[PDB]
Amino acid sequence: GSSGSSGPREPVVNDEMCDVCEVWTAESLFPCRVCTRVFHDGCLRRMGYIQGDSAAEVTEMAHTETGWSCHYCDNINLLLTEESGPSSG
Ligand SMILES: [Zn+2]
Ligand SMILES: [Zn+2]
């Protein structure tokens, strides 16, 4: 194979490291910032998590404070009809 890596000084460890890249960036990380679990939208579609035809007229609107909310959070922040269907009870 091949080997070659040194440096007894390891970089800071942040819990906000992509689960597919394990890397962060100054700017806001996707999907969200607060949501501990961070994963690049592309890392999902690529690997094989989404691969769904979700043609939309939007590129990336997560960074913003009030934009897209990942599944984990699934917050009803966005102002729009979110008719839900909970188990009849
Ligand atoms: Zn990633
Ligand atoms: Zn989220």
Side-chain angles (χ1 to χ4, degrees):
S2 74
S3 170
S5 274
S6 292
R9 58 208 88 86
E10 275 200 85
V12 62
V13 157
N14 34 315
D15 298 80
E16 282 79 31
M17 275 194 144
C18 191
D19 39 23
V20 170
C21 302
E22 305 269 313
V23 297
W24 85 280
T25 316
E27 65 200 89
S28 272
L29 182 50
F30 284 47
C32 326
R33 166 68 77 160
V34 179
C35 282
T36 304
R37 197 79 170 159
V38 299
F39 30 88
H40 310 173
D41 72 318
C43 269
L44 303 162
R45 81 187 176 164
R46 194 279 204 75
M47 287 270 284
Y49 276 107
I50 330 186
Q51 209 175 111
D53 184 26
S54 66
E57 303 302 67
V58 59
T59 305
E60 279 188 38
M61 283 274 120
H63 163 117
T64 57
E65 180 206 279
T66 56
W68 290 86
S69 29
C70 73
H71 167 71
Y72 275 111
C73 52
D74 269 336
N75 277 45
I76 63 158
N77 155 22
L78 198 75
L79 167 71
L80 210 90
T81 184
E82 200 51 278
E83 200 172 26
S84 64
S87 75
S88 273

